[PDB]
Amino acid sequence: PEMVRGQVFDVGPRYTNLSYIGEGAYGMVCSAYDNVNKVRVAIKKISPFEHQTYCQRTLREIKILLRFRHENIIGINDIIRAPTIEQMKDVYIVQDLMETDLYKLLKTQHLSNDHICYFLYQILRGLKYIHSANVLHRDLKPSNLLLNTTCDLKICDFGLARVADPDHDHTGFLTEYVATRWYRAPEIMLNSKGYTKSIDIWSVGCILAEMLSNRPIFPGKHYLDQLNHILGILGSPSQEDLNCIINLKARNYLLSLPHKNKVPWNRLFPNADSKALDLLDKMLTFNPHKRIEVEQALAHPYLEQYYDPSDEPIAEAPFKFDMELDDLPKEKLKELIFEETARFQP
Numbered sequence: 376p377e378m379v380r381g382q383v384f385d386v387g388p389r390y391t392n393l394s395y396i397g398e399g400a401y402g403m404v405c406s407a408y409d410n411v412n413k414v415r416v417a418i419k420k421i422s423p424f425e426h427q428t429y430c431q432r433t434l435r436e437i438k439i440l441l442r443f444r445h446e447n448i449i450g451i452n453d454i455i456r457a458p459t460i461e462q463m464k465d466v467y468i469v470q471d472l473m474e475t476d477l478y479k480l481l482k483t484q485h486l487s488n489d490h491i492c493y494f495l496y497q498i499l500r501g502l503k504y505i506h507s508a509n510v511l512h513r514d515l516k517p518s519n520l521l522l523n524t525t526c527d528l529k530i531c532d533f534g535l536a537r538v539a540d541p542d543h544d545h546t547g548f549l550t551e552y553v554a555t556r557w558y559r560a561p562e563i564m565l566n567s568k569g570y571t572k573s574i575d576i577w578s579v580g581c582i583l584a585e586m587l588s589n590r591p592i593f594p595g596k597h598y599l600d601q602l603n604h605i606l607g608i609l610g611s612p613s614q615e616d617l618n619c620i621i622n623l624k625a626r627n628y629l630l631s632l633p634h635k636n637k638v639p640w641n642r643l644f645p646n647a648d649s650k651a652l653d654l655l656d657k658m659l660t661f662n663p664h665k666r667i668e669v670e671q672a673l674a675h676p677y678l679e680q681y682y683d684p685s686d687e688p689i690a691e692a693p694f695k696f697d698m699e700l701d702d703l704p705k706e707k708l709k710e711l712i713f714e715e716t717a718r719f720q721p
């Protein structure tokens with residue numbers, strides 16, 4: 376068993392020459408030479424089985440990424456685990472190796488307007504496919520966008536992804552939420568469980584804004600501060616948009632705030648392309664019902680150099696989970712992970 380930073384990384388006989396890349400709560404990631412395809416790959420060692428929420432993330436990632444096939448979505452190339460459920464403590468997921476991610480890039484590099492345009496195009500292209508499968512990614516952010524040395528982009532981490540469910544989207548005011556705070560749509564804090572495609576469009580808007588200036592647009596320090604950052608730029612919602620929020624706690628919170636006018640995008644982003652700011656405005660619309668959809672965004676003048684709907688493929692059918700995963704015990708989720716990964720056993 377090869378070891379990396381005091382941890383077993385047992386991926387042989389196919390994968391050798393391991394080099395450490397990083398780690399986090401999820402586990403650990405290495406590059407490795409793949410002796411079958413003869414190319415270096417990324418391998419992440421996930422050890423989720425003592426934690427129900429980690430099992431859910433692992434299973435969603437595996438089921439979705441194995442069904443999806445798209446140039447702007449990271450694939451799963453192979454999964455290594457023990458031959459029996461008893462002996463399985465870890466799952467190793469093999470994926471195409473990427474140079475960097477957009478979080479690291481925005482901390483270190485100015486993006487040209489052409490780079491911003493091309494990155495936004497690829498995000499929206501991959502998202503068109505995801506949405507066409509009736510799936511919501513639900514956690515789009517710079518660190519979930521991987522890039523190679525020629526700036527090809529792939530969406531990663533489907534651990535919070537789910538099937539769209541607009542009929543069950545309504546909730547009360549200040550309902551707790553899991554996905555990354557700075558990229559949450561305003562309606563999450565007011566009346567939405569984040570079960571519709573419009574949630575993802577908001578996140579992409581936030582990402583576009585961040586590419587424009589290298590700084591997050593709405594860096595909320597805690598749950599309600601996130602909403603207050605959004606309203607600081609968008610200004611007070613209009614009467615029509617406010618009347619859409621029928622829950623009185625949420626409506627009356629909004630009515631309690633002093634009037635704030637919209638901060639023009641060209642004041643926040645004085646060097647930005649005007650067409651980019653027009654698309655930004657449409658992605659960062661307060662009212663999710665008025666928010667631009669993914670296929671409309673691709674058709675926007677800002678992306679005219681790239682737009683080609685015949686080359687923006689959709690999924691062959693809607694994605695469905697067999698059963699709802701949200702509440703299943705971790706022991707049951709382990710079984711499901713075992714079954715989902717069986718096809719990679721020799």
Ligand SMILES: C[C@H](C(=O)N[C@H](CO)c1cccc(N2CCN(C)CC2)n1)N1Cc2ccc(-c3nc(NC4CCOCC4)ncc3Cl)cc2C1=O
Nearest residue numbers: 400401404417429432436470472473474475476531532534
């Ligand atoms: C978290 C998520 C993940 O695996 N998540 C899983 C399912 O959700 C998971 C399982 C259980 C828990 C959990 N948590 C814990 C709680 N936490 C709040 C959220 C995450 N997450 N990661 C980690 C990860 C590491 C590397 C790469 C990757 N990197 C490169 N190159 C490098 C080169 C240097 O520059 C940056 C790029 N090339 C290809 C790839 Cl594939 C991708 C991912 C990915 O998707």
